[PDB]
Paper text:
MIC2 contains a von Willebrand factor type A (VWA) domain and six tandem thrombospondin type 1 repeat (TSR) domains in its ectodomain. In this study, we report crystal structures of M2AP alone and in complex with TSR6.
The optimized crystals of M2AP β-domain alone (we referred as M2AP hereinafter) and its complex with TSR6 diffracted to high resolution (1.8–2 Å). However, structure of M2AP alone could not be solved using molecular replacement with the previous NMR model. These strands form two β-sheets that make up two opposite faces, with one face being more hydrophobic than the other. The binding on the M2AP side is quite rigid, as only slight variations were identified when comparing the complex structure with the M2AP-only structure. Notable differences include the Trp-180 bearing loop region that moves slightly toward the TSR6, consistent with previous literature identifying Trp-180 and its nearby hydrophobic patch as the key region for binding with MIC213.
Author numbering: 48 to 92, 96 to 227
Amino acid sequence: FLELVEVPCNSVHVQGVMTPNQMVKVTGAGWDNGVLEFYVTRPTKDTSRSHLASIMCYSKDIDGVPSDKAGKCFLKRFSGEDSSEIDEKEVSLPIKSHNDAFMFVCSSNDGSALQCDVFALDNTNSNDGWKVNTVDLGVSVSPDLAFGLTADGVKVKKLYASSGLTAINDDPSLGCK
């Protein structure tokens, strides 16, 4: 959307702060097993990182997932001061299954709040089209935010950021290649 450039790495690490209206995009075709986690981390303030926010999606198509979790997604917020968990909350997102294709598109409208558009193509009925819901992550932009996925076997993971965003593209520890 607009001028998105692929980030040749495994996650999107922003240099500095996100100005308003730039975007980062994380896409995949699904995952193999377990929970899908979309993360936003920030630098801890020795040079380590801490979660700022997390979206965890439980597949409706894996036997044994609790009935109160299966096919649901949850937003976990963390304190931007002591890295403490503030709260968890169910959020309405179109990702229902680990066989769905999906995209996360995150931006800050005013340089302060972070929100993401979450797109999914439901595998269990891929004959409907794409669906999208927007989620406010309920945290504020900090310098040097990182965005990515943590999951067992994400299929065809690709990453993009706005042209005007400074994204790390040469750190071998981020799988940059």
